[PDB]
């Protein structure tokens, strides 16, 4: 529908509204249904003299191209070190959003030039982009110690670094700390459909640059990873599957003090913990498990449990009480 | 998989296709930017300037210069000028404000 | 107790008045007044800027003739200018853009009315013709020394505000004395009037005029520059005559900063004026 | 990379096959109703829950429909469900009411997220080591958020 | 049978030749983007010369000569007349490496040392 609207508003004299054609043309075109808008997003990215649309450019390109993790950083690869700092910074936003929730190392290996530059913009959004990928990642799979320690060296390097750089540094350090590793983000659902307030939270969260209290809308995109085996609405069972991999590989990076298979998985009473999407192929329900759904639990999500025994001993467990919550 | 590799692959054909006119746009624009910054660093070099004298070159592309007042100045020289003008006893000429050398003068 | 994040709108009106005033930036202190309207707390727009006659005292509160000030102001009011003063500016040639005790004291007096009270220093004397870097400066309150210095929100633009990073003046004198960011505005009548004004300032009247002139200086003058072009070409070819021995010996590392290529590409680009203007001659000969 | 001009029709005719099968499958009714987003393709399956008289099978497709795929289409289908039922009366009422909550997910989120939390003094003490009163003061509390 | 093996098989062979065509579009995108990285780094390099242009606006820098190092990390340095400016030099360079009675590179206003000189 809005193609004549946004192409009409793309020839605007106003640079702000020229950005707003791109910010607008993201959410109409998400899902990479358009090989058309990438032409003029990149064309206004290179062609225009004002850097507002140029750092505002490629985020809509991530918003359409979120389906493939692979195809993005190869074509933002030149934009990693661009001409101006602003296409460097918007490129850091683009690698931030296209690779978020993933494990693609093709954004990660490009961060080591991004983390060191005379400009504080690319140093800040280098840490912001670094914060969005390393979340929900174990070291034994992928070598992340380098970006751990360069992420840690800024809050001791805050004496000799910029005042806005350290802001995105420790602000980026809260992203790994978010929810005590339990909650995460996802750009799309289990069905492959994409969530609207996740997109809202991430793009308005990228609009913290002009107005910084808008970064509080990041919490609208928080997707906790767990399972549901809830059989009845008021009945809680205890459901124990097993993982086909090592339990030590998946654990929490327990910090400093500062004063080949699991026999079963540790998710119970359904407290399902965080779970990697790659763990959804190594989840194994027990054959000796008493209760079992009608639907084969194949991938992680929301299912119900069926009572197979249909007898006594449903194993009701109580509910918590008043405190920090209700 | 096998017959899906065709139409799956066609999207990679299109995505590699879209980089063509994009790299055309970059290759046409950034050389215009190159003559922008080239002419702009050229017009920094203006002919009214002060003449000093060269004393020593202590490392590559950075040297010291005796001013006309006798005080010695430490200036990183401009990159376009080659190593012929690193002659130790030379008639060097910096700018009056930038104090970087455009040209040396024949004695 | 509140402070916000302000940003100064600068038109080309005020700008070229400060550039005529910067051509009037001869060694003596000069005086001028910025006018406009304050629409809110945290945005400020300038429109009207004029200059003031000099005095042997220079810039002072005594230099401000208030009946001459308000006289010219009221003459602007009977014209289409109902704007209050938004600040006062001057030039600090040679010794840098910072503000003396006279400057900070008459600033201290002239900020009693307007709480914003913008102060601007134009200094084209040591400013090159490549960049026209100008900055608007600010006074901190002396009772804010106990608290943090500048409680300015939205710290994005300060990466652009670290462009004044001279290693004596800005942070050499930044205590009690801070600054504010500068952005512009250009509407489409200024854009296309100034744009076609400047393209026309690089184009001709009927525009077909100087074409055949250089088409026929290709036959009268540029032939000499073509022969001299071949002389620099061949005069490099005697150097490239020796090069395939060097390339036939070492091939490891590069010692010559002279490239011999892109200069000759440029020589060809200047040589193609003959080709481009030959068809121009064909059009003039046609009709 | 469909243009949607055929794809939604292909799906709304490719959902005609499993209703003719012995059972309805939920992956296909999800993966159509996340794309075609049609009330006429949900108006059947909302009232098939009564004819099937089966509580357990509805709850999965209900929970991920109230989870995902729509906002105003959910706001339309909830009042399409409001006309359904009484203006098994007693058991369908608790079905149609308790599926449209969505806050049981919020309650379980509050329960496992009330019992899984991990906070460390190194991070927050490191922020207090690094805090300044102007800029990173909000960075500390947004990390705390 | 003999279509997916033969007719769609040669259709797949034509797809492999299309992958050769995307190997041509591939390596053109490769070498044109390496040229693009070259122009980006070169125009970026003269842009960093514009970063040097503020140190051109510094009017250059002076020539410091330390004759005596002082133990309070405030080095007295013999300067051109009306000089003898005692100062702490820059934090990224240690004091003890700067040997006395040798010539150094000093900025003209901020009085921070760059390097030892012969
Ligand atoms: Zn003076």
Swiss-Prot record, chain B:
Coiled-coil portions: none
Domain of life of the organism encoding this protein: Eukaryota
Cell location: Cytoplasm; Nucleus
Protein family according to the UniProt entry: Belongs to the AAA ATPase family.
Role, per record: Component of the 26S proteasome, a multiprotein complex involved in the ATP-dependent degradation of ubiquitinated proteins. This complex plays a key role in the maintenance of protein homeostasis by removing misfolded or damaged proteins, which could impair cellular functions, and by removing proteins whose functions are no longer required. Therefore, the proteasome participates in numerous cellular processes, including cell cycle progression, apoptosis, or DNA damage repair.
Subunit-structure text: Component of the 19S proteasome regulatory particle complex. The 26S proteasome consists of a 20S core particle (CP) and two 19S regulatory subunits (RP). The regulatory particle is made of a lid composed of 9 subunits, a base containing 6 ATPases including PSMC4 and few additional components. Interacts with NR1I3. Interacts with PAAF1. Interacts with TRIM5. Interacts with ZFAND1.
Name of the featured protein: 26S proteasome regulatory subunit 6B
UniProtKB/Swiss-Prot annotation, chain C:
Residue positions binding Zn(2+): 90, 92, 103
Domain MPN: 8-143
CDD domains assigned to the protein according to its UniProt record, in alphabetical order: MPN_RPN11_CSN5
SMART domains: JAB_MPN
Top-level taxonomic group: Eukaryota
GO molecular function: endopeptidase activator activity; K63-linked deubiquitinase activity; metal ion binding; metal-dependent deubiquitinase activity; metallopeptidase activity; proteasome binding
EC number: 3.4.19.-
Disulfide bonds: none
Keywords: DNA damage, DNA repair, Hydrolase, Metal-binding, Metalloprotease, Phosphoprotein, Protease, Proteasome, Ubl conjugation pathway, Zinc
Protein's recorded name: 26S proteasome non-ATPase regulatory subunit 14
Quaternary context: Component of the 19S proteasome regulatory particle complex. The 26S proteasome consists of a 20S core particle (CP) and two 19S regulatory subunits (RP). The regulatory particle is made of a lid composed of 9 subunits including PSMD4, a base containing 6 ATPases and few additional components. Within the complex, PSMD4 interacts with subunit PSMD7 through their respective MPN domain. Interacts with TXNL1.
Gene Ontology biological process terms in this record: double-strand break repair via homologous recombination; double-strand break repair via nonhomologous end joining; proteasome-mediated ubiquitin-dependent protein catabolic process; protein deubiquitination; protein K63-linked deubiquitination; regulation of proteasomal protein catabolic process; response to ethanol; ubiquitin-dependent protein catabolic process
Residue numbers bearing the Phosphoserine modification: 127, 201
Family under the similarity heading: Belongs to the peptidase M67A family. PSMD14 subfamily.
Curated annotation (Swiss-Prot), chain D:
Disulfide-bond pairs as recorded: none
Coiled-coil ranges from the UniProt annotation: none
Superkingdom in the source lineage: Eukaryota
Residues recorded with modification Phosphothreonine: 86
Subunit architecture: Component of the 19S proteasome regulatory particle complex. The 26S proteasome consists of a 20S core particle (CP) and two 19S regulatory subunits (RP). The regulatory particle is made of a lid composed of 9 subunits, a base containing 6 ATPases and few additional components including PSMD1. Interacts with ADRM1. Interacts with ZFAND1.
Family per record: Belongs to the proteasome subunit S1 family.
Role summary: Component of the 26S proteasome, a multiprotein complex involved in the ATP-dependent degradation of ubiquitinated proteins. This complex plays a key role in the maintenance of protein homeostasis by removing misfolded or damaged proteins, which could impair cellular functions, and by removing proteins whose functions are no longer required. Therefore, the proteasome participates in numerous cellular processes, including cell cycle progression, apoptosis, or DNA damage repair.
Protein name, per record: 26S proteasome non-ATPase regulatory subunit 1
Organism this protein belongs to: Homo sapiens
Source organism phylogeny: Eukaryota, Metazoa, Chordata, Craniata, Vertebrata
Curated annotation (Swiss-Prot), chain E:
Location of Phosphoserine modifications: 110
Signal peptide range in chain numbering: none
Reported impact of residue 50 to Q: In a colorectal cancer sample; somatic mutation
Subcellular localization(s) per the UniProt record: Cytoplasm; Nucleus
This protein's name: 26S proteasome regulatory subunit 8
Role according to the record: Component of the 26S proteasome, a multiprotein complex involved in the ATP-dependent degradation of ubiquitinated proteins. This complex plays a key role in the maintenance of protein homeostasis by removing misfolded or damaged proteins, which could impair cellular functions, and by removing proteins whose functions are no longer required. Therefore, the proteasome participates in numerous cellular processes, including cell cycle progression, apoptosis, or DNA damage repair.
The family this protein is said to belong to: Belongs to the AAA ATPase family.
Summary of subunit composition and partner proteins: Component of the 19S proteasome regulatory particle complex. The 26S proteasome consists of a 20S core particle (CP) and two 19S regulatory subunits (RP). The regulatory particle is made of a lid composed of 9 subunits, a base containing 6 ATPases including PSMC5 and few additional components. Component of a complex with USP49 and RUVBL1. Interacts with PRPF19. Interacts with TRIM5. Interacts with NDC80. Interacts with PAAF1. Interacts, in vitro, with the thyroid hormone receptor (in a thyroid hormone T3-dependent manner) and with retinoid X receptor (RXR). Interacts with ERCC6.
């Amino acid at each position: 529908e809005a193609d004549a609207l946004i192409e009409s508003l793309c020839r605007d004299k106003d640079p702000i509204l020229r950005r707003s054609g791109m910010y607008t043309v993201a959410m109409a075109y998400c899902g990479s249904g358009n090989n058309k808008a990438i032409r003029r997003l990149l064309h206004v990215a290179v062609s225009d003299v004002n850097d507002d649309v140029r750092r505002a450019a490629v985020e809509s390109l991530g918003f359409i191209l979120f389906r493939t993790p692979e195809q993005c950083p190869s074509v933002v690869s030149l934009l990693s070190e661009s001409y101006n700092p602003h296409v460097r910074y918007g490129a850091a936003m683009a690698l931030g959003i296209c690779c978020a929730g993933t494990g693609n190392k093709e954004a990660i290996n490009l961060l080591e030039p991004m983390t060191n530059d005379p400009v504080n913009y690319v140093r800040q959004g280098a840490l912001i982009a670094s914060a969005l990928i390393m979340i929900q990642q174990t070291e034994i799979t992928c070598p992340k110690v380098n970006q751990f320690r360069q992420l840690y060296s800024k809050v001791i390097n805050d004496k000799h670094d910029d005042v806005m750089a350290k802001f995105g540094a420790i602000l980026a350090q809260g992203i790994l700390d978010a929810g005590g590793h339990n909650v995460t983000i996802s750009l799309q659902s289990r069905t492959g459909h994409t969530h609207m307030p996740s997109v809202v939270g991430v793009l308005v969260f990228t609009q913290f640059w002009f107005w910084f209290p808008l970064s509080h809308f990041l919490s609208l995109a928080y997707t906790p990873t767990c399972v549901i085996g809830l059989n009845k609405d008021l009945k809680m069972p205890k459901v124990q599957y097993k993982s086909n991999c090592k339990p030590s590989t998946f654990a929490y990076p327990a910090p400093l003090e500062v004063p080949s298979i699991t026999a079963k998985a540790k998710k119970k009473e359904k407290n399902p913990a965080r779970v990697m999407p790659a763990q959804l192929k190594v989840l194994t329900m027990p054959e000796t498990c008493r209760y079992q759904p009608f639907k084969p639990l194949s991938i992680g999500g929301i299912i119900i449990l069926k009572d197979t025994s249909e007898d006594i001993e449903e194993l009701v467990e109580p509910v918590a009480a008043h405190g920090p919550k209700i | 998989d096998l017959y899906s590799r065709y139409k799956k692959l066609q999207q990679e054909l299109e995505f590699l296709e879209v980089q063509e006119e994009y790299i055309k746009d970059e290759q046409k624009n950034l050389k215009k930017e190159f003559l922008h910054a080239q002419e702009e660093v050229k017009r920094i070099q203006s002919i009214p300037l002060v003449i000093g004298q060269f004393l020593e070159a202590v490392d590559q592309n950075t040297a010291i210069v005796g001013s006309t007042t006798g005080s010695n100045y430490y200036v990183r020289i401009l990159s376009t000028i080659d190593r012929e003008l690193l002659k130790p006893n030379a008639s060097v000429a910096l700018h009056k404000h930038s104090n970087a050398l455009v040209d040396v003068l024949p004695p | 107790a509140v402070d916000t994040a302000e940003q100064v709108y600068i038109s080309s009106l005020a700008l070229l008045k400060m550039l005529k005033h910067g051509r009037a930036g001869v060694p003596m202190e000069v005086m001028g007044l910025m006018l406009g309207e304050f629409v809110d707390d945290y945005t400020v727009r300038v429109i009207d800027v004029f200059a003031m006659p000099q005095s042997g005292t220079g810039v002072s509160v005594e230099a401000v003739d208030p009946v001459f000030q308000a006289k010219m102001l009221d003459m602007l009011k009977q014209t289409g200018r109902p704007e209050m003063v938004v600040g006062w500016y001057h030039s600090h040639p040679g010794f840098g853009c910072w503000l003396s005790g006279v400057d900070i004291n008459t600033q201290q007096s002239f900020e009693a009315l307007s709480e914003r009270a913008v102060a601007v220093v134009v200094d084209p004397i040591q400013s090159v013709k490549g960049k026209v870097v100008i900055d608007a400066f600010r006074l901190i309150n002396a009772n804010m020394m106990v608290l943090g210095h500048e409680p300015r929100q939205t710290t994005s633009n300060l990466g652009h505000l670290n462009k004044p990073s001279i290693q004596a003046l800005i942070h050499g004198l930044n205590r009690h004395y801070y600054s504010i960011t500068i952005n512009y505005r250009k509407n489409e009548l200024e854009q296309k009037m100034l744009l076609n004004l400047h393209k026309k300032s690089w184009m001709e009247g009927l525009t077909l005029q100087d074409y055949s002139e250089h088409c026929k200086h290709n036959e009268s003058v540029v032939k000499e520059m073509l022969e001299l072009a071949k002389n620099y070409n061949k005069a490099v070819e005697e150097e490239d005559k020796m090069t395939p021995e060097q390339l036939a010996i070492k091939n490891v590392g590069k010692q010559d900063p002279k490239r011999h290529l892109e200069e000759h590409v440029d020589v060809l680009m200047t040589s193609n004026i003959v080709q481009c203007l030959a068809a121009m001659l064909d059009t003039v000969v046609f009709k | 990379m469909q243009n949607k001009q055929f794809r939604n029709k292909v799906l709304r005719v490719l959902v005609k096959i499993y209703m003719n099968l012995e059972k309805p499958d939920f992956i296909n009714v999800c993966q159509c109703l996340i794309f075609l987003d049609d009330p006429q393709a949900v108006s059947d399956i909302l009232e098939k829950l009564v004819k099937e008289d089966n509580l357990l099978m509805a709850y999965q497709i209900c929970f991920d429909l109230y989870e995902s795929a729509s906002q105003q289409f959910l706001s339309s289908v909830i009042q399409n469900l409001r006309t359904v039922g009484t203006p098994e009366p007693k058991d369908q009422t608790l079905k149609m009411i308790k599926i449209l909550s969505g806050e049981m997910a919020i309650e379980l989120h509050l329960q496992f997220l009330i019992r899984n939390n991990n906070t460390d003094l190194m991070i927050l003490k490191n922020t207090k080591d690094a805090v300044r009163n102007s800029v990173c003061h909000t960075a500390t509390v947004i990390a705390n958020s | 049978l003999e279509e997916g093996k033969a007719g769609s098989g040669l259709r797949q062979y034509y797809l492999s030749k299309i992958e050769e065509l995307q190997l041509i579009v591939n390596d053109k995108s490769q070498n044109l983007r390496r040229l693009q990285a070259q122009r980006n780094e070169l125009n970026a390099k003269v842009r960093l010369l514009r970063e040097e242009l503020q140190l051109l606006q510094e009017q250059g820098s002076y020539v410091g000569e330390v004759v005596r190092a002082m133990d309070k990390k405030k080095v007295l340095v013999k300067v051109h007349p009306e000089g003898k400016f005692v100062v702490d030099v820059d934090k990224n360079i240690d004091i003890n490496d700067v040997t006395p009675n040798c010539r150094v590179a000093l900025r003209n206003d901020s009085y921070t040392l760059h390097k030892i000189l012969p």
